[PDB]
Amino acid sequence: NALPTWWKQAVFYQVYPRSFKDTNGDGIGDLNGIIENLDYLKKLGIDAIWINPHYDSPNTDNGYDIRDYRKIMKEYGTMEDFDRLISEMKKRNMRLMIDIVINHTSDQHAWFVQSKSGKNNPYRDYYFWRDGKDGHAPNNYPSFFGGSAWEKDDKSGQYYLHYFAKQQPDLNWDNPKVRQDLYDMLRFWLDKGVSGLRFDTVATYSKIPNFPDLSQQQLKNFAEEYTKGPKIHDYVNEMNREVLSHYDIATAGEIFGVPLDKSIKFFDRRRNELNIAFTFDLIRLDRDADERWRRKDWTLSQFRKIVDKVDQTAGEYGWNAFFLDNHDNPRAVSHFGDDRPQWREHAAKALATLTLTQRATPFIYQGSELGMTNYPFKKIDDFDDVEVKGFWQDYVETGKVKAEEFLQNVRQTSRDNSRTPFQWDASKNAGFTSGTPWLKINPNYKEINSADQINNPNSVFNYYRKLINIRHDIPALTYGSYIDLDPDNNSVYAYTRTLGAEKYLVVINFKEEVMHYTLPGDLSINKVITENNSHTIVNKNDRQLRLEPWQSGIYKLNP
Ligand SMILES: [Ca+2]
């Protein structure tokens, strides 16, 4: 029964404003820098842009600690700039999604400033304030960003709750006044015409009644305890009923800490909650659930089995986003491909083909379209992210893990690998800034930059452009049902996308050797749609493919 919508068949691009384009030489990207480059994104073929938080913030967590929801970040520009970004996008038929961060505010936000003044302030129970127990915190909750999730306040002697930085106190959603104020805030932005909202850590809004301690076992996977709040779907559905269902918008849910088997309740269209699932299963398939900075080896069979299970779980009534990287994860060509110079461009084109042939709304993160890589961080001070500093404090400063072993993992897992500034050209600081970038630019910018690619028809950029054109032209690549040809194959990832008689096959060789691959059953090729790194001709009725290393392709199959 499912209906097409613009957001199901959109190709989104994600801009992290702080690292996209600086137009005033302070080293920090800003809104004018986005506006300046809308034609570049239109040329790529992007339907909609999701921007990370753009609100007044002290930047403990680069926009995710909001000091005033109705004001533009000072480093990003003014309200007039933000309105111009909407206006200039609208002229180009591009839709804007903004990031909604309402699990918590900055500890500088006026509500918290008031809350913390005494048990008595009308804003006290806007946040969570509990007595200590035995001269320590109210319970054994840890924070995602290091140490205890409870911060002592010497004035009152109680502690306040912060799942994330102590500068990110959690809002009390159990207070209907808090929920009402947040809805008013959402209407202020929605009335400006924004087309989409992405809800940061949407699954933590409901806290566990009476805050009991976590078990020893729970402490090793605590995020999954924080998403078990008994009213979470009541609150998300109330927000849908009172606000979301009043605008023509697309809503995405970042369901951090939600196991896949509890995800469909946020996205089933019958439930009137949210529209698009942002899950962590694939992008962190190789991350430890306890030591969340640690990675382990992974295989293509592990990867594809997660793709399939994520696809199955959305089923008839939910809907997924699909992304291999974003501002919270290492770059896709490094993590999932081979970023050495022999292979980088082929592997980036193969992961683009994978991304843009999923039954999901694809999100392209800034710079993935050039094949940008992870950055060669050497020492702990080369990073800037609050989260990596919290993991260092919890695991290296306690002597639990050697500094060098920790660094070998966070070089591969740090959020900062995707935050080095966008590589526009081969000029100084890759054309990102006339001043000093806030985070050092990868020296590979001389090889990997947009200017070198945009007019080269063989570039990663133009392969993405072609794939997006192909996706927009073939309905089965958006809405077709997905079948993995062999979930246990660790060499060649092959799967079909089917709408009625229209059946297409995607084949990607993840090996760096030639692989012969014979199709199953009676499948045979009707025609080639696109290939990268092919050295062979594929004809009507062919049943076998010779795949060069990192070869990728889309084919239409015979009925
Ligand atoms: Ca700037």
Q: DSSP letters along 338-354, please?
A: --STTTHHHHHHHHHHH
In the block, residue with structure tokens 């209907």? 176
277, 255 contact by CB (below 8 A)? yes
d(C-alpha 123, C-alpha 117), whole Å? 9
In the block, residue with structure tokens 């609208």? 90
Q: What is the largest CA-CA distance in the chain?
A: 78
Q: How far is the CA of 392 from the centre of ligand 1 (A)?
A: 30
According to the annotation, is 382 in a ligand binding site? Answer: no
d(C-alpha 409, C-alpha 319), whole Å? 32
Quote the DSSP letter at residue 455.
T
Could you give the 3-state DSSP secondary structure of residue 397? coil
Q: What six digits make up the tokens of 133?
A: 């127990």
d(C-alpha 52, C-alpha 45), whole Å? 20
Determine phi and psi for 459, rounding to 5 degrees. Answer: -85, 165
Question: Which residues sit opposite 342 in a β-bridge?
Answer: none
Domain that residue 182 falls in: 1-105+176-480
CATH number at residue 235: 3.20.20.80
d(C-alpha 150, C-alpha 350), whole Å? 45
According to the annotation, is 30 in a ligand binding site? Answer: yes
According to the annotation, is 134 in a ligand binding site? Answer: no
d(C-alpha 129, C-alpha 150), whole Å? 9
- Rounded to the nearest angstrom, the gap between the alpha carbon of residue 177 and the centroid of all alpha carbons in its chain is 30
Domain boundary among 175, 206, 227: 175
CA 202-206-207 angle, 5° bins: 125
Domain boundary among 445, 480, 515: 480
Instruction: Please give the C-alpha separations between residue 144 and each of 25, 221, 274, 293, in angstroms, as whole numbers.
Output: 33, 11, 25, 11
* Resolution of this deposited model, Å: 1.7
Q: How far is the CA of 516 from the centre of ligand 1 (A)?
A: 51
Q: How far is the CA of 327 from the centre of ligand 1 (A)?
A: 19
Strand ranges for 225-342 from DSSP E? 250-254, 276-278, 321-322
Q: Do 189 and 254 fall within a single domain?
A: yes
Domain boundary among 480, 502, 536: 480
In the block, residue with structure tokens 């110079």? 341
Contacts of 55 (CB under 8 A, 6+ apart): 63, 66, 67, 68, 69, 70, 71, 72, 73, 101
Active site residues: 200, 254
Q: How far is the CA of 29 from the centre of ligand 1 (A)?
A: 5
d(C-alpha 374, C-alpha 68), whole Å? 33
417, 330 contact by CB (below 8 A)? yes
327, 14 contact by CB (below 8 A)? yes
Q: Do 475 and 485 fall within a single domain?
A: no
Burial 99-132 (b: 16+ CB within 10 A, else e): bbbbbbbbbbbebbeebbeeeeeebbebbbbeee
139, 106 contact by CB (below 8 A)? no
- DSSP result, 142-205: BPTTSSBSEEE-TTTSEEEE-SS-TTSPBB-TTSHHHHHHHHHHHHHHHTTT--EEEETTGGGS
Please report how many Cα atoms fall inside a 13 Å half-sphere around the Cα of residue 306, on the Cβ side: 17
Q: Do 142 and 285 fall within a single domain?
A: no
d(C-alpha 512, C-alpha 386), whole Å? 37
Quote the DSSP letter at residue 102.
-
Nearest of 264, 236, 263 to residue 251 by alpha carbon: 236
Helix locations, 284-402, DSSP H: 300-314, 332-335, 344-355, 386-395
Q: What six digits make up the tokens of 551?
A: 């070869």
Burial 432-454 (b: 16+ CB within 10 A, else e): bbeeebbbebbebbeebbbebbb
Q: Do 502 and 460 fall within a single domain?
A: no
> Using CA of residue 459, residue 463, residue 468, residue 469, what is the dihedral sign?
positive
First to last CA, the chain: 24
According to the annotation, is 47 in a ligand binding site? Answer: no
DSSP-derived pairing of the beta strands 492-499 and 481-484: antiparallel
Q: Do 554 and 462 fall within a single domain?
A: no
111, 126 contact by CB (below 8 A)? yes
Contacts of 83 (CB under 8 A, 6+ apart): 192
Instruction: Please give the C-alpha separations between residue 449 and each of 68, 221, 425, 432, 529, in angstroms, as whole numbers.
Output: 35, 40, 5, 10, 27
Q: Do 294 and 414 fall within a single domain?
A: yes
Per the entry, the structure determination technique was: X-ray
In the block, residue with structure tokens 């008994």? 230
Q: Do 384 and 528 fall within a single domain?
A: no
348, 460 contact by CB (below 8 A)? yes
In the block, residue with structure tokens 């109210």? 138
Instruction: Please give the C-alpha separations between residue 485 and each of 7, 45, 324, 396, in angstroms, as whole numbers.
Output: 28, 30, 21, 44
272, 239 contact by CB (below 8 A)? no
If phi > 0 it is left, if psi is from -120 to 50 it is alpha, else beta; for residue 48 that is beta
326, 367 contact by CB (below 8 A)? no
Q: Do 30 and 64 fall within a single domain?
A: yes
Q: Do 448 and 550 fall within a single domain?
A: no
Nearest of 164, 147, 137 to residue 395 by alpha carbon: 147
d(C-alpha 215, C-alpha 347), whole Å? 43
Strand order from edge to edge, sheet including 129-131: 129-131, 158-161, 150-152
According to the annotation, is 28 in a ligand binding site? Answer: yes
Q: Do 375 and 239 fall within a single domain?
A: yes
Please report how many Cα atoms fall inside a 13 Å half-sphere around the Cα of residue 238, on the Cβ side: 15
Q: How far is the CA of 78 from the centre of ligand 1 (A)?
A: 12
Q: Do 122 and 205 fall within a single domain?
A: no
Q: Do 191 and 49 fall within a single domain?
A: yes
CATH number at residue 487: 2.60.40.1180
The number of beta carbons lying within 10 Å of the beta carbon of residue 148 is 17
Q: How many domains does the chain have?
A: 3
CATH number at residue 150: 3.90.400.10
Instruction: Please give the C-alpha separations between residue 189 and each of 17, 69, 247, in angstroms, as whole numbers.
Output: 18, 9, 11
Q: How far is the CA of 26 from the centre of ligand 1 (A)?
A: 5
196, 96 contact by CB (below 8 A)? yes
Q: For ligand 1, a single-atom ion, which residues have Cβ within 5 Å?
A: 22, 24, 26, 28, 30
Could you give the 3-state DSSP secondary structure of residue 495? strand
